[PDB]
Amino acid sequence: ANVSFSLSGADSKSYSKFITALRKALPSKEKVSNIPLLLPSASGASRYILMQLSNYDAKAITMAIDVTNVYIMGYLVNSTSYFFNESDAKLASQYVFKGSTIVTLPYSGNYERLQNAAGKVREKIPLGFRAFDSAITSLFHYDSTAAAGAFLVIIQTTAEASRFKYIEGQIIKRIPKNEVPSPAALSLENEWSALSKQIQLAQTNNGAFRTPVVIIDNKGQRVEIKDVNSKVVTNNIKLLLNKQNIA
Numbered sequence: 001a002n003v004s005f006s007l008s009g010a011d012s013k014s015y016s017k018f019i020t021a022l023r024k025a026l027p028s029k030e031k032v033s034n035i036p037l038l039l040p041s042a043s044g045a046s047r048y049i050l051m052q053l054s055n056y057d058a059k060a061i062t063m064a065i066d067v068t069n070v071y072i073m074g075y076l077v078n079s080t081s082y083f084f085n086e087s088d089a090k091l092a093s094q095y096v097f098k099g100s101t102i103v104t105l106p107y108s109g110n111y112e113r114l115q116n117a118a119g120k121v122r123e124k125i126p127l128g129f130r131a132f133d134s135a136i137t138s139l140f141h142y143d144s145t146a147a148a149g150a151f152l153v154i155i156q157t158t159a160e161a162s163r164f165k166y167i168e169g170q171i172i173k174r175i176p177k178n179e180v181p182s183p184a185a186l187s188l189e190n191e192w193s194a195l196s197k198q199i200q201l202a203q204t205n206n207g208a209f210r211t212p213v214v215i216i217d218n219k220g221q222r223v224e225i226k227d228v229n230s231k232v233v234t235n236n237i238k239l240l241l242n243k244q245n246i247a
C-alpha cells in the first residue's frame with residue numbers, strides 16, 4: 001500500500017502523520033494559492049493509490065483511491081474485492097487488486113446513495129477512533145447490512161480529513177469519545193468542489209471569488225467565503241479538485 005494506518009497504539013500524532021502521508025501520496029504538478037492542485041487526469045494503474053487500514057485487533061483491509069478526486073473506489077480483504085456500483089469504480093477494477101474475485105456493491109459511492117443505503121444521514125453518524133475501528137471490522141467481514149454506514153465513517157475519516165485541516169481536527173477531538181461531526185464539517189465536505197473551483201478562478205480575478213461559497217460555521221451561522229485571503233483558504237483546505245473535473 002502507498003499509505004497505511006493502524007489503530008493499535010495510535011494517538012493524535014500518529015493519526016496526523018498518516019493524514020499528512022495521504023496528502024503527500026497524491027500526485028500534484030503544482031500549487032494554487034499554496035494549495036496542491038490534484039491532477040486533471042491519470043491513466044491506468046497510476047490513477048490509484050492504495051491505503052491500508054488495520055483495526056485494534058490488527059485486522060486489515062486495503063482501499064483503492066482515485067488520485068484525481070480522492071474518492072474511494074472499493075477495497076480488498078482476503079482475496080475478494082468490493083467496488084462501488086459506478087463507472088469510475090468499474091474502471092478501477094480493471095487496474096487494482098488484480099487476481100481477486102470482484103464483487104460489485106449494491107450502491108454507488110456518493111453521499112446521498114450511501115445515506116439512503118445506511119438509512120441514516122451524516123449528521124447522525126458518530127465519528128472517532130472506536131467508530132473507525134468498528135467500521136473497519138464491518139468491512140473486514142463484509143457485514144452487508146453495516147457496509148454503507150462503515151463507508152460513511154471511513155470516507156470522512158480519511159478522504160475528507162485529507163482535504164480539510166478542520167475535519168482532520170474533528171477526528172482528533174473524537175479520539176477519546178465518538179461524536180457526530182459538527183455542521184461546519186459537513187458544510188466543508190459539501191462545498192469542496194465549489195471551493196476548489198473558486199480558488200482557481202480567483203487566480204485571474206485578483207484573489208476574489210467569481211461566486212462566493214457559502215458554508216456554516218462552528219457557531220451554526222451562515223458565512224460567505226469570497227476571496228483567497230479567507231482563513232478557510234490559508235489555513236484549512238489542503239487539496240484542490242482540478243477545475244477540469246468540476247464544471
Ligand SMILES: *[C@@H]1O[C@H](CO)[C@@H](O)[C@H](O)[C@H]1NC(C)=O
Nearest residue numbers: 001002025026027048049050
Ligand atoms: C503507489 O504504490 C505503487 C505500488 O508500489 C507504485 O507503483 C506507485 O508509483 C505509488 N504511487 C504513488 C504516487 O506513490
Ligand SMILES: *[C@@H]1O[C@H](CO)[C@@H](O)[C@H](O)[C@H]1NC(C)=O
Nearest residue numbers: 085086103104105106107108
Ligand atoms: C448497478 O446499478 C445498475 C443501475 O445503474 C443496475 O442495473 C445493476 O443491477 C446494479 N448492480 C448491482 C451490483 O446492484
Ligand SMILES: *[C@@H]1O[C@H](CO)[C@@H](O)[C@H](O)[C@H]1NC(C)=O
Nearest residue numbers: 077078080139140141142143
Ligand atoms: C477474511 O478472512 C477472515 C479470516 O478467515 C474472516 O474472518 C473474514 O470474515 C473474511 N472476510 C471476508 C469478507 O470474507
